[PDB]
DNA sequence: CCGACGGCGCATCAGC
DNA sequence: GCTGATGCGC
DNA sequence: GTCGG
Ligand SMILES: Nc1ccn([C@H]2C[C@H](O)[C@@H](COP(=O)(O)C(F)(F)P(=O)(O)OP(=O)(O)O)O2)c(=O)n1
């Protein structure tokens with residue numbers, strides 16, 4: 286909030302480029318700038334001052350000077366007053382509707398919540414659930430509720446097979462006081478980078494969570510990644526809790542560290558860390574860290590026994606989860 | 612200048 | 628049916 | 638939109 290006005294602005298611009306312009310690199314450029322400025326420990330006084338930060342160039346510097354002097358950005362003022370842009374931006378807030386589908390729906394005249402509700406038949410499964418819980422999915426989850434959800438998840442998976450280990454990652458692992466959803470990393474000794482000695486490992490867990498009515502809907506589901514909806518149980522006469530988004534990722538037990546590093550995020554932190562990795566001659570994904578041979582092709586996985594080992598390879602001092610919120 | 616920008620799971624679809 | 632490209636998401 | 642070779 287120290288430079289909240291500016292970071293909000295950049296984030297709006299980022300969303301515009303992504304949702305309306307369908308210019309993903311501009312989206313990432315604005316988010317990185319917003320990110321680096323967000324952690325700058327001083328109340329920015331000018332675009333020039335901001336341009337010193339990495340990720341902030343000439344264009345954003347000018348915008349920062351406009352925002353600082355007028356308190357607003359004409360470029361955004363116009364975007365807001367543009368019906369097509371406003372429609373597209375709104376529609377993309379429904380989970381399952383991205384930049385493309387939003388523009389297409391608008392072409393059909395489907396541009397409001399009311400339009401979507403009356404044309405449910407024109408949405409795929411994911412979009413339909415996103416619409417169904419539109420209001421709920423925008424609500425934040427207090428950490429206290431995250432704690433209650435964690436308890437249910439770990440206890441239920443334990444009941445399935447005491448050998449499963451479920452770790453809540455995402456902003457929760459980063460110590461956030463509220464999260465947008467729950468991200469669960471799941472491992473089991475039967476599934477390694479060497480073999481899958483037991484099928485349905487993810488399925489069984491999803492099944493159990495559905496049996497107890499924790500998981501209520503499914504957006505997508507595969508062998509290693511589940512994307513759905515869940516809800517905490519409420520007491521008698523007690524109003525129900527909002528439905529929440531839940532992501533479950535099954536990862537080879539031997540590649541847990543690259544996995545937890547990936548799922549802990551933040552997304553921008555991963556982008557920055559993986560970019561740094563490449564500059565240092567390495568490539569990092571959720572399974573391994575590999576050196577990039579002279580040719581440019583990834584080599585064999587390097588030994589990893591802690592999150593810190595990954596950091597050492599790329600010559601970065603270790604950073605606790607709570608400091609990875611970029 | 613201008614090529615690169617992190618990396619990948621699941622749903623859907625065109626082409627064969 | 629498969630496979631590769633695209634959309635959307637983590 | 639920003640960066641580095
Ligand atoms: N583009 C991305 C997106 C995600 N992630 C990894 C790194 C992320 O930490 C992790 C979770 O994705 P999430 O989509 O639940 C998130 F990001 F919003 P979270 O950080 O959890 O914040 P919140 O509380 O609001 O959900 O996936 C990634 O690597 N790249």
Ligand SMILES: [Cl-]
Pocket residue numbers: 307308309310311312
């Ligand atoms: Cl772009």
Ligand SMILES: [Cl-]
Pocket residue numbers: 539540541542543544572573589590
């Ligand atoms: Cl690992």
Ligand SMILES: [Cl-]
Pocket residue numbers: 570572573
């Ligand atoms: Cl790999």
Ligand SMILES: [Mg+2]
Pocket residue numbers: 455456464465466467468
């Ligand atoms: Mg999350």
Ligand SMILES: [Mg+2]
Pocket residue numbers: 455466467468531532637
């Ligand atoms: Mg998530």
Ligand code: NA
Pocket residue numbers: 335336337338339340341342
């Ligand atoms: Na800069």
Ligand code: NA
Pocket residue numbers: 376377378379380381382383
């Ligand atoms: Na969406």
